[PDB]
Amino acid sequence: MKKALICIDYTNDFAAENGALTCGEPARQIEDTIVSLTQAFIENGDYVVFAVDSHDADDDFHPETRLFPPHNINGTEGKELYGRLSPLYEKHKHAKNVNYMEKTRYSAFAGTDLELKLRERQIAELHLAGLCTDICVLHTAVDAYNKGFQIVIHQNAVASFNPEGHEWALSHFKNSIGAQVAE
């Protein structure tokens, strides 16, 4: 089918050692694999969306401001893509098949035009990568499922701080959502 890759929240704040909300080693462990995956999609001409948590500094209306320290703030280094993913994007950010999409909830669909863009391009298969397996990847997958997309989870290109949550999520994807979980 026509494919798209959604590369979720692979920012400094979620992966870097002093990430404002860092997932730590597991997050950095997938750097090479997710950079390779994303590059492969971009070079093969498939649709690639960098879906990135985006926060204003002064926003007492955002639900997450009740739960979390400031993170992925617009204009700060924390929001920048982590490691070798940041130059990849920089290299390709003008490409037609590359979309940088700011999002304000865990799911890449929520309050965005992701579905609009995907339908325009008649995309039927959504590949998911990024952080966290059992939060943003999960919610995105739930929306994708309910919206009728075929789903592929790249299990070596996703990670979470919580190993048990990561495991739980991969099993949920295979057994409940009926996604393909790919190595």
Interface contacts to a copy of itself, rule CB under 8 A: 63-64, 66-67, 105-107, 110-111, 134-135, 138-139, 142-143, 145-146, 162, 164-165, 168, 172, 175-176, 178
Q: Which does 53 bind (CB under 5 to 8 A by kind): a copy of itself, Zn ion, none?
A: Zn ion
Contact 129, 52 (CB under 8 A): no
- CB 156: neighbour CB atoms within 10 A? 15
Complex with a copy of itself: residue 44 or 146, whichever CB lies closer: 146
Amino acid at 172: H
The distance of closest approach from Cβ of residue 97 to Zn ion in the complex, given in angstroms and rounded to an integer, is 26
The closest of 117, 152, 114, 108 to 10, measured between CA atoms, is: 108
**Residue of the chain from 9, 13, 53, 143 that contacts Zn ion (CB under 5 A):** 53
Alpha-carbon dihedral angle through residues 111, 26, 5, 173, given to the nearest 10 degrees: -80
Q: Which of 133, 136, 135 is nearest to 174 (CA)?
A: 133
State which residue, 74 or 171, has the beta carbon closest to a copy of itself: 171
The residues that touch Zn ion, with contacts defined as CB under 5 A, are 53, 64
